[PDB]
Amino acid sequence: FNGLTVLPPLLTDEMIAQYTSALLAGTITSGWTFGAGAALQIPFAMQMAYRFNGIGVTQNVLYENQKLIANQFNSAIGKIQDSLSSTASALGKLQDVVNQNAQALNTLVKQLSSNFGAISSVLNDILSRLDKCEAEVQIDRLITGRLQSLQTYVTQQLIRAAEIRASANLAATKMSECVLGQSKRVDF
Amino acid sequence: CSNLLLQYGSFCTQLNRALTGIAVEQDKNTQEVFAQVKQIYKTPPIKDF
Amino acid sequence: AYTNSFTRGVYYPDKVFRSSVLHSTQDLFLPFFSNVTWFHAINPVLPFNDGVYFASTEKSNIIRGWIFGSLLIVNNATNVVIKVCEFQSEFRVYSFEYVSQPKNLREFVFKNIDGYFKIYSKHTPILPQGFSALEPLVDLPIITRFQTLLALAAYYVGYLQPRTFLLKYNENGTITDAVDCALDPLSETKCTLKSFTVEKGIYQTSNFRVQPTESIVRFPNITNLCPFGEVFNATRFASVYAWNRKRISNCVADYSVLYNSASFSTFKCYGVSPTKLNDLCFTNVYADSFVIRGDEVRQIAPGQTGKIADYNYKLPCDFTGCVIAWNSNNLNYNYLYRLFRKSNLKPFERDPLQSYGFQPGYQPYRVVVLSFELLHAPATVCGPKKSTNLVKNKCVNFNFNGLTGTGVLTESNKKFLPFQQFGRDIADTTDAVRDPQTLEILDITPCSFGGVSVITPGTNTSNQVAVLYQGVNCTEVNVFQTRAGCLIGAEHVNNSYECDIPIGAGICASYQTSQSIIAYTMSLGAENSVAYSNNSIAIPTNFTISVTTEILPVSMTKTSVDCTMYICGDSTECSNLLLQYGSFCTQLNRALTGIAVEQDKNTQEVFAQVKQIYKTPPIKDFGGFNFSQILPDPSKPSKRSFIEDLLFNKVTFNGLTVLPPLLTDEMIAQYTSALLAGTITSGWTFGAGAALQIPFAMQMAYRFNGIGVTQNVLYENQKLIANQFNSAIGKIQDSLSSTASALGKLQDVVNQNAQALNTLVKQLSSNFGAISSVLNDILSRLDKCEAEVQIDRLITGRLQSLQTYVTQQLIRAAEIRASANLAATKMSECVLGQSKRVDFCGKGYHLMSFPQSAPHGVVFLHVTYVPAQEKNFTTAPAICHDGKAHFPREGVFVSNGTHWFVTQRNFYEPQIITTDNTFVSGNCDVVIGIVNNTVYDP
Amino acid sequence: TGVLTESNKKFLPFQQFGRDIADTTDAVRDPQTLEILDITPCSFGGVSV
Amino acid sequence: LGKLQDVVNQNAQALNTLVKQLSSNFGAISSVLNDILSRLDKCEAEVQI
Ligand SMILES: C=CC1=C(C)/C(=C/c2[nH]c(/C=C3N=C(/C=C4\NC(=O)C(C)=C4C=C)C(C)=C\3CCC(=O)O)c(CCC(=O)O)c2C)NC1=O
Ligand SMILES: *[C@@H]1O[C@H](CO)[C@@H](O[C@@H]2O[C@H](CO)[C@@H](O)[C@H](O)[C@H]2NC(C)=O)[C@H](O)[C@H]1NC(C)=O
Ligand SMILES: *[C@@H]1O[C@H](CO)[C@@H](O[C@@H]2O[C@H](CO)[C@@H](O)[C@H](O)[C@H]2NC(C)=O)[C@H](O)[C@H]1NC(C)=O
Ligand SMILES: *[C@@H]1O[C@H](CO)[C@@H](O)[C@H](O)[C@H]1NC(C)=O
Ligand SMILES: *[C@@H]1O[C@H](CO)[C@@H](O)[C@H](O)[C@H]1NC(C)=O
Ligand SMILES: *[C@@H]1O[C@H](CO)[C@@H](O)[C@H](O)[C@H]1NC(C)=O
Ligand SMILES: *[C@@H]1O[C@H](CO)[C@@H](O)[C@H](O)[C@H]1NC(C)=O
Ligand SMILES: *[C@@H]1O[C@H](CO)[C@@H](O)[C@H](O)[C@H]1NC(C)=O
Ligand SMILES: *[C@@H]1O[C@H](CO)[C@@H](O)[C@H](O)[C@H]1NC(C)=O
Ligand SMILES: *[C@@H]1O[C@H](CO)[C@@H](O)[C@H](O)[C@H]1NC(C)=O
Ligand SMILES: *[C@@H]1O[C@H](CO)[C@@H](O)[C@H](O)[C@H]1NC(C)=O
Ligand SMILES: *[C@@H]1O[C@H](CO)[C@@H](O)[C@H](O)[C@H]1NC(C)=O
Ligand SMILES: *[C@@H]1O[C@H](CO)[C@@H](O)[C@H](O)[C@H]1NC(C)=O
Ligand SMILES: *[C@@H]1O[C@H](CO)[C@@H](O)[C@H](O)[C@H]1NC(C)=O
């Protein structure tokens, strides 16, 4: 409440979740076809055979190890829940993003408590203690430094937003290549 | 203090412009990542995969 | 009577010529569409509020009086007379004398500003709706009233008020249009954008604050007067060796009676002004009294050097207080004072001794100093101000014991321990307070504030607007509350469409049907349910060839800014002063030079991916594919393609220098022509070494084989594919010859660099606290030593503008470099080859791509394969023939109901299931879904 | 400082000087003879080796 | 190897510049803090510092 305003995101969390549900449904029911145009349905065990054929394993392997593969996948999915229901350290990349924006803001607000060489950090105190001509000097001293704090904050935010944009472009590329299709790129 | 701030020109039209650009870019980032699908597909009630 | 002022009463505000510019100025103007009083003469004694507009449509002109106040101006239709004296066919105006020289819509504007009576006028032949600027007239030297005399028709009178206007000057330099800024939200948007046209979108125009209703002065219930008589009228003052410190606390001090008293010679207040002293509350007061010589009265001040300052009484540098000295030559060898000390005294420290005499410069002076403590500890001593009754749940201007502030006071559940007087938060702001009169706790919440945004479609479509008050609850301002704030002027609709203008929190707005602005929740897309079954597949039977354009910035305008010019325009003195700041401006130049070099590197990386300059043959036989729209044509002077020209027409002296790019546009076009020729004539081979020629219809078959479609499809649908591609290429021209919005990614790059530069240049018009923004004016008005200060003030701020600009440019150049690296990767992977990466080289299965130069960018025409006509079939993972399972070698098994076929997966081409399109492994007892069918043996 | 040239700009006969986008004195009116002179800053530019 | 060498050089030039900025007055009487503290009293040295 100091001129700060946090705008809400255009896409609410429910609707991000709806997008992800749509992507999962398309991947499950149609494979990579829904990314190239109309969603063409296909049994899951078949697009899985396609995906094995795409890594150099012929498709009889899947049909002869169907139950084993399904059990392995189910166990892995179960292990993800155990990794995420006990340990909070896996989410750090996001948590830092929340923290960095907080620390940047708090600092900014705390810079309102600094004199910057003036008699006081409170503008109304200066205006109530001093005449116009003498208060002008101190208020200019405060402006020169509150403005500098804003410039510092905005430069930091621009750099951080560039980093976040790089990460978001990577995430979009992964969604396009890892979800909407399968990738031959190694360790991508 | 506003009258005194006017002596510094237009630092704070451009600061607002920068922050507004950042905010718009965030929505663009989310749009680019998640809105990669034309329609909203739904899984069938029966789950035989 | 009454009528409307249809955008009348606009005049040239100054004697400055401006042309082809939208200039914003704020002064006394007639508001647009205001109610202007009609009159019909038969006197009417009008007022002079701040300035009078005056329109008239007569020859008679019996408006023959201009009385003020005594100022009495008369304009008698032949000679102007002005008489300033105490005044009280016929001359019945009343019971310095200036004289000036001896069917129509006559317009006039009168105002009195700074002792200047300004008349502006426009005598135009025949309120008429329209626009007409008012040129000035005689400005007179010299008052709150007006008169028109009727010495024994239609005239309209407005009233100017302070308004901001956006005047539009044409090429001839005359005003053709204007915008009343504070009329409607749309005009505020026009002001913010500095334009007369607004595109569809949401624009942050201004900010909204809840103004305080009343001021609450709340001081404790104490009335005992402070004991100031007993330290001023005391009979004996202690000597300056041991200055007598008397504490004052817990009383009401009246400082005005001391200040207005004439007995005191000097009353010097440091850190406070004596007039404001009654408005303040101090935690503690110290009154230190002593007597000194008259010439040493200046030594009692912060930051002074002398025997008294260092050895007797030391004031701190940050001394908040007052010093009061009066000549007391009535009340002598009894004044001991230290003269020799082994060091300097600490501030407010009391301790070789000398005693100068006094025989009635050398005269005695009795002095006291009132050291105040404006801490945030509990206030004890205060002024005589009354304590108003408090109010709650309302934005007020509160003042608790000198703690001023603005906000709503509410009852608090916070439990204060009974020694705590106020509260704080993480921000170290006053979250709560304790009322001195009644010992209760009040929470302080700053009353509502927030930005206000204007939802508008393009002004081409309509002038309707909605207004979003961001993050407020507009019970505190049809009307519809949202999670992003609240929206007025737009109606809520339960339907859901695609987003047109984003509001936030899932809410979008659009101009739709009478037509109005509607608000709704965005619909994420058409609802579709995939008919998934564990034995059904959907095979395409046809396809489409789709050409989609991807626009990528590559570079931006190379620029270089000489600091010594921008900061110190051909000034030696300012250059010498700039040298004191070191080497800021060798490194700023280095940074900008690095950016400029990086731009050329970006273009080199993107376009110079080809060893040689390939040329297409004169004969164009590419299997029916028509590349005339993208290949260069020699008829044009610049060897550019048709699409390249369409793209090149859709994009639009202060130490600044714009360097030219190393690669001219013609040569970028030559690079792109070479890439197109190589792609057409040789395929992907020219990127891997020597260009190996191949018929186009064949490398196209290769590219189909690379997306999982066998090559007979192409040869059997050659003409259809060629026609589809040609039609798509034709549609690109229609998309680019009418709509300019497709090129936005480049246009912004051009705009951002422009706005950054203009701002920079405009920062040269700012004082930054100095007397003037013009360096030569300061150097011509002031001496060297005094001009040095102001010039340093200007440098500190012009240098800051440069640093801001260069930081912005570095960040933007990083973004542009990222985009250029992406464009180079696309050229390498989409053009020099075909990419298996999904949605990288366009949507669909990538076939190829075409580069086209664009201003500071590149355009990739991605030709992709999109399957078109799906058909349901029943399928099976395998087939049991003779107890052994057969799997498809390449493809999938399908059935039209009766027979079983094997077909490729991206195009329905059924074939008889034989032993060469299938392979056998295992027995038919482990595969789930295997079916029984015969497998033919060749 | 600059070069003074004859101007085709038409000043209305109350306008004493002119400006540009940069809010710099693009033109001027000569007090002695009532004529209009365009102001152009005389040539400057970096030198490279 | 230039792409690496520049990285070594850019970090060096940035640092040297920084250190050299300690030799500038910035309008003060001297660039050496102890000189100001030894030449001036507390209140007057406060301004220059
Ligand atoms: C009273 C003081 C007075 C004022 C302020 C005034 C303003 C004024 N009137 C003008 C035109 C003119 N002004 C008038 C007459 C009048 N216009 C009036 O405001 C009034 C009150 C009359 C008298 C009844 C006429 C007839 C013209 C010429 C219009 C034409 O071409 O027919 C002009 C343009 C002169 C030029 O450059 O050609 C000015 C500046 N004239 C005056 O006499
Ligand atoms: C595949 O689609 C194309 C069009 O996308 C079809 O070609 C059209 O055929 C009709 C007649 O059936 C003509 O009137 C159109 O002019 C054709 N269009 C083009 C662009 O040539 C084609 O017939 C479809 N193939 C199948 C097997 O249905
Ligand atoms: C490739 O397309 C262009 C148009 O995009 C064709 O040029 C047209 O040719 C016809 C004659 O067949 C003329 O009547 C038109 O005026 C031409 N239009 C333009 C814009 O030049 C060109 O003929 C096509 N190429 C082939 C080989 O058919
Ligand atoms: C005169 O102006 C006032 C203020 O806008 C308006 O309320 C009133 O209706 C107007 N009168 C007429 C006759 O239009
Ligand atoms: C005004 O501008 C137009 C532009 O077409 C020009 O022709 C004309 O000479 C100018 N002057 C006048 C008085 O119209
Ligand atoms: C006088 O002071 C007491 C002390 O708390 C307070 O309760 C009372 O309201 C005060 N009187 C007035 C008139 O303010
Ligand atoms: C001191 O006494 C004189 C006369 O007795 C009086 O006029 C003056 O107001 C007194 N000053 C103070 C501070 O009491
Ligand atoms: C807005 O005000 C209403 C009425 O005072 C209240 O019920 C609501 O909780 C407030 N906050 C909102 C709508 O977020
Ligand atoms: C929209 O839905 C809300 C749901 O509560 C309902 O109250 C309202 O009447 C609906 N409006 C229309 C126009 O259907
Ligand atoms: C396939 O069958 C489903 C349900 O039987 C139907 O919804 C879908 O439209 C069919 N596909 C085609 C191409 O007709
Ligand atoms: C399936 O295809 C075969 C061969 O083309 C044909 O003889 C048969 O009639 C078809 N059956 C159906 C139901 O389409
Ligand atoms: C799944 O396939 C098996 C055999 O292929 C079939 O018996 C079963 O009915 C199918 N699932 C459903 C839900 O029909
Ligand atoms: C397939 O053939 C085998 C052996 O001929 C038989 O045991 C089995 O029941 C058959 N299944 C179907 C679905 O016809
Ligand atoms: C005197 O003033 C007039 C007014 O314009 C001007 O024309 C003339 O040149 C001036 N005389 C001299 C000697 O400058």
Numbering used by the authors:
A (entry chain C): 855 to 1042
B (entry chain C): 749 to 797
C (entry chain A): 27 to 68, 81 to 107, 116 to 134, 155 to 161, 168 to 174, 187 to 210, 216 to 231, 235 to 244, ...
D (entry chain B): 549 to 597
E (entry chain B): 945 to 993
Direct quotes from the study:
The spike (S) protein of coronaviruses is responsible for interaction with cellular receptors and fusion with the target cell membrane. To overcome this challenge, based on the locked SARS-CoV-2 S-R/PP structure, we engineered cysteines residues replacing positions D427 and V987 to generate a new disulfide-stabilized S protein S-R/x3.
Therefore, we determined the structure of the S-R/x3/D614G spike. Despite the presence of the x3 disulfide bond, 81% of the particles are in a closed conformation. In contrast, in the closed and open spike structures (independent of whether 614 is D or G) these interactions are lost, and the 617–641 loop density is disordered. Superposition of locked and closed structures indicates that the loss of interactions at the domain C/D junction leaves the junction unrestrained, allowing domain C and the RBD to move relative to domain D and the NTD and allowing the spike to open. We proposed that the capture of this intermediate form reflects rapid transition of the D614G spike away from the locked-2 conformation, consistent with our observations that the majority of S-R/D614G spike is open and that even in the presence of x3, only a minority of S-R/x3/D614G spikes adopt the locked-2 conformation.
